[PDB]
Design a protein around this nucleic acid. Structure first.
Length: 270
RNA sequence: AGGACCGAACCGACUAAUGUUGAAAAAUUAGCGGAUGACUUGUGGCUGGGGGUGAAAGGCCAAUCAAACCGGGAGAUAGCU
RNA sequence: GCUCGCCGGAAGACCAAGGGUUCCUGUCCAACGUUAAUCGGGGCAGGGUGAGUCGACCCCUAAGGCGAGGCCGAAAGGCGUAGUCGAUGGGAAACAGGUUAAUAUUCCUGUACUUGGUGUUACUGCGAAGGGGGGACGGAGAAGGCUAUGUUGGCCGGGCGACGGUUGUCCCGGUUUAAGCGUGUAGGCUGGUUUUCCAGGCAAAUCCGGAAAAUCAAGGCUGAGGCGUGAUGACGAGGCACUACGGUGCUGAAGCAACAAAUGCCCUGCUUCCAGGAAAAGCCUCUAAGCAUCAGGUAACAUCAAAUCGUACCCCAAACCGACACAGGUGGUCAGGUAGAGAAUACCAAGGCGCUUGAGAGAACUCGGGUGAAGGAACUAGGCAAAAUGGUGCCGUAACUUCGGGAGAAGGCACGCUGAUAUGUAGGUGAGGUCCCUCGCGGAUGGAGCUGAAAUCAGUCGAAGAUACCAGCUGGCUGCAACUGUUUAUUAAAAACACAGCACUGUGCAAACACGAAAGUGGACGUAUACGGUGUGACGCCUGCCCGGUGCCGGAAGGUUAAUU
RNA sequence: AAUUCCUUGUCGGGUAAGUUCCGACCUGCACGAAUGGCGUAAUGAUGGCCAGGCUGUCUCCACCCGAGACUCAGUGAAAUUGAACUCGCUGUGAGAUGCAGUGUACCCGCGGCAAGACGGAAAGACCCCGUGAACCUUUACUAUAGCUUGACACUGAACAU
RNA sequence: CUUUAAUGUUUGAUGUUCUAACGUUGACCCGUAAUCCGGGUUGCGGACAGUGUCUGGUGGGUAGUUUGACUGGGGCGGUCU
């Protein structure tokens, strides 16, 4: 639930938490865990490729199954769990054969609900079927863009895409960004929405709350000397067009220079 | 419960005096700040010079930084001493 | 040798790193020592470092490094797979006492433990470069139960006091003892046992997981400490023979109990929280191909082996880093006594020091401090500095406010000692004894003994009772920034930088973007409630007019227009 | 006003006396609404200001305890230094120990002050010069990485218009 | 030779389709106890994309440079035959 803390101290006035008693108050399933060494925004060369990244709280990787290729075997939800590697919560399921796996937790899922993957599955949240069998005008998540590789769209907290049409071997979708894309009509998609919608109402309330996530502080550039176009000056001058480091606009300039697909795009956005 | 309160260690370094061929190539003395945290610290590792890193001061990169050090071009050039 | 003074959560003791003989002894004093020097971390010579259990090596791996092939790249070379290296982490075993001028858990004494090899005997399904389990893990907080250790008492030994008193409720000292083995408690976790069955764990599996039944509820795992054993021993204040008064043999009393009590152990526990908490091996199991009167496996007994290197000395320092025997810097461990909340502070113990120039004098002036008539900031750029405040308990406490604060607001009263209440109370601990029993490290009852505040009344001393050290000045108006934080190592700690929060914008995943000639990596094992960039900078009321100019995003009728032809 | 030149703006508060400070007026030289505007409890080794207490901050210094300074013994530096038999005054040459004139002055030390020796220290950082630099900015010049446009090549087959 | 249409060859423009180059940081098999790489099957894209050469535009993102003299100091102004 979305709860507002009390201002007993500076650092708790504007903080807002998202707690859920339905989550597992213990350790997760170990066989589905693996190391996750932090990077710091650096690469194999040791250079900072992405800034504002470093430190934070340790994490272990929850092996998630975005493919959902176990068809013809129902599984029931054992327990919900909190995943640090992502914003949404996951769910530990148990397959009749004794196989346990993690999946994204949809909107209205609990511990004990049944779900199944495949073309012969039922139309209920949590089930995975190819969009060829999914009706038109529905709401799905963890959508696949190529059959066999795994869901890649609508994997976030409260994200969901809506199927808009299906002409042939392709189906048109309106992604959460407002984009109207079309993918093959054989890509597996999951029914329902990822349930953490209140995740966006969360509020850090203090700086250190961001440093736990691994986010390092951000320095603007206006008072930045040889180091950034904006640079400096006696006072707050900034008498030039807003520009990135390395010299690009950042306030309207489109940088889509792929031009490979150019087919699935219909209503890019806005 | 807490980037909460007082306050040692620990980490810092606001004021004054001394010292200024000093005890010390930035410290001492008396006070001062934080002190469960964006904390602190050991060991090892990565980032290499028009580059790195930088909660950004043109700050730090071995007492050296508006472009490190060493060697080489090199007996640079100097209408100036 | 006798006094004095200093440190004593260190200026004591044990180590790592580092240094590398500075360690012990003898001998020497030119230079080195900021003086002298018979002395020395000096010079010369000699001596000294003993390990199956400590550590390294070794097995395992993190970050990350190298990297067969391979991909990429003018050459150089770069990235990287399989693999192989790499601790600051995981992994088998030793304690006490004694001993040397210098070493010892390494030697001696006594008592133990661990992993292996081999052999004998008996019983036998053994088997991996695979599977599974386990190893294996956060922060804060709450207590409870123990010990280290300490205090008092008792006991044993000695003592009867340089000056009044001291055979007594007196004084001093001692009152220690391990690993391991046996017991398995406080307490923590878990529901167990048997059988059948299955799309799972690459294949297999009796193992793990899962499913459906029967059958019982006590079963097991973990576990500080305690007791006993170890120990008729060792140690032991002191003696007795020697005693070059350096010390060597022998002998050697008591060696208990209560109370208090940790920041350590139970505890990798319990509870709770969001920021959601390493890996791999050893170890326990499972089977595969294969081997079965074999080989291997299990238990006992015997025997053998456990190599190699380090081990001296310093280690908050005169031995390391600072050119110095330099007020500096340097990580971890042990953590006594009185008062105290306390690792502050004051005084002491253990133990270690008095800091490698002294003597005398008692002018100016300087440094560091103390006191001060009357006045009390009139000083000064400025209350710089100094002075002052300073504690616990109770009462009391404004505007303003985001209702949390402000706040320790301000302010005011009381604090010692003795006695009684109560020969030491409430409370805490808990004996013998008694009763029960699943008869045990059990439960109940029992309250001796020990320990022990706080308060009231009364009385009493002093100028002064929070008497030392220690230990907030307070209040008001107001600018800036929300706040905690960060920064110009070495003249600037701020109104600057961050900041949570807001907005614009880009980004549909082989994402944008970035480092890279490229491969590729990061972004991210993330997917628009995400990521990047820019500006603003909590919260609250708000954020107005202008697209002519530049830029950005779009569009077309035409014109202009590159290579090319 | 962290912004106001005129300027110590005018009035008022507070002080015996207030260029600062506080509160209003607006005549905003030259505030202004996310390079944000106006407020804001709390916080701050933050800036400014007013009181109480407090005191040697001062009026106005005085004494005292210690460490140096002073003397003795021992060891034993340094910056600086053209050479010195190294006075004042006035004038002169452009601020005289050294010239002129004149005055004064026995020789040599110790302890103190710091006016001068344009004292020591650092080939002035300010100013200017140089057809010296180095960094930084931009609608300065010329190039360039990158991004982007198209032609040709890697690159072919049909069909229809 | 002045002339004009269905055809034939001829080449060019636009559009649709296809697959065989090429791409695949999709799936599966092997090398192979290997998320590298390659090969193989197959699917999706598909002569687009991407790369090489040429070329226009943009290009302080980055380099190499310029930015006068006289002057009652220099600058501003003025001046330069």
């Amino acid at each position: 639930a979305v709860v507002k803390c009390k201002p007993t101290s500076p650092g708790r006035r504007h903080v807002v938490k998202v707690v859920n008693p339905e989550l597992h108050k213990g350790k997760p399933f170990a066989p589905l865990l693996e190391k996750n060494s932090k990077s710091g925004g650096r690469n194999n060369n040791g250079r900072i490729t992405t800034r504002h990244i470093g430190g934070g709280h340790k994490q272990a990787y929850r092996i998630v199954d975005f493919k959902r290729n176990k068809d013809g075997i129902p599984a029931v939800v054992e327990r919900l769990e909190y995943d640090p590697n992502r914003s949404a919560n996951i769910a530990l399921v148990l397959y009749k054969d004794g196989e346990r796996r993690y999946i994204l937790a949809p909107k209205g899922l609990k511990a004990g609900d049944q779900i199944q993957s495949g073309v012969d599955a039922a139309i209920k949240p949590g089930n995975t079927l190819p969009m060829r069998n999914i009706p038109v005008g529905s709401t799905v998540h963890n959508v696949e863009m190529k059959p066999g590789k795994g869901g890649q769209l609508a994997r976030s907290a409260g994200t969901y895409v809506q199927i808009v049409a299906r002409d042939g071997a392709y189906v048109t979708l309106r992604l959460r960004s407002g984009e109207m894309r079309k993918v093959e009509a054989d890509c597996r998609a999951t029914l329902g929405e990822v349930g953490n919608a209140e995740h966006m109402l969360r509020v850090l309330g203090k700086a250190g709350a961001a440093r736990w996530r691994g986010v390092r502080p951000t320095v603007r550039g206006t008072a930045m000397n040889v180091d950034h176009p904006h640079g400096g000056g006696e006072g707050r001058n900034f008498g030039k067009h807003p520009v990135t480091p390395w010299g690009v606009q950042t306030k309207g300039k489109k940088t889509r220079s792929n031009k490979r697909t150019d087919k699935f795009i219909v209503r890019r956005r806005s």
